[PDB]
């Protein structure tokens, strides 16, 4: 997928996670987010097409998904255990990471 299909996959599944009722549904939505975040790590954001492919800011932009992918990983494991409320809370606190990168390059 391209960058914004991924971004609309991170967002849709955030709402799904906040509204889910069993482990399976949270586990399902986080698994999608992780694939999306990894695929996103390829792309070149609009704001940085006018700069060099290995701009430091292009490296800052890839590092931001590592933070994100590692927090989906913790969230996912809570879900695999069945601590649904804890998994829901972890997913909710991802918006810090989404919106840190957002104000830089969005």
């Amino acid at each position: 997928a391209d960058l914004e299909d991924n971004m609309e996959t991170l967002n849709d599944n955030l709402k799904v996670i906040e509204k889910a009722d069993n482990a399976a549904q949270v586990k399902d939505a986080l698994t999608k987010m992780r694939a999306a975040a990894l695929d996103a790590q390829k792309a070149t954001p609009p704001k940085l097409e006018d700069k060099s492919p290995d701009s430091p800011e292009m490296h800052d932009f890839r590092h931001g998904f590592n933070i994100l992918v590692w927090q989906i990983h913790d969230a996912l494991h809570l879900a695999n255990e069945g601590k649904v409320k804890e998994a829901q809370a972890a997913a909710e606190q991802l918006k810090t990471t989404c919106n840190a990168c957002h104000q830089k390059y969005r």
Copy 2:
């Protein structure tokens, strides 16, 4: 290790995983695959020696191991739990990822 020693480590341990009987053996072979996949992520594939070190295709080639390393991670956790059959099935479905990258740069 170099690129093809790693590739022959991914392959040998695939057969090992498909033929194992306890959690320990699957866990052992997947742990080897993860080290191999990470070490592989360094290398420069033959097909891309004649292109620039930061070719997009050299970045596509490193991204492919992330997909791979993250699916070994799930497989490994099933094994740590003891769901041997589920871990065996996850390892089997890695060949999609092996052969996606393969037709591009192998």
Copy 3:
């Protein structure tokens, strides 16, 4: 944080882990190490300021944290399970990875 604040976070938490008594304390210190190791992956080490931003040695330097981040991950999961002694032993065997990179670029 900058590179050496991260390095002094990896070190402080190593001692903390070796001296902890419950799962929670090990889990706490490893979680800090993982954030530190990821943040460190950005930086450019002193020894390699006088070389190109995408030196192979600058790529070797980022690969070293993957090895490190993936071994904190295993350690952390032992701690989440409550195998404190096993988690303590995993953290102790990280110094191989710390000191492999150290003799290259420290």
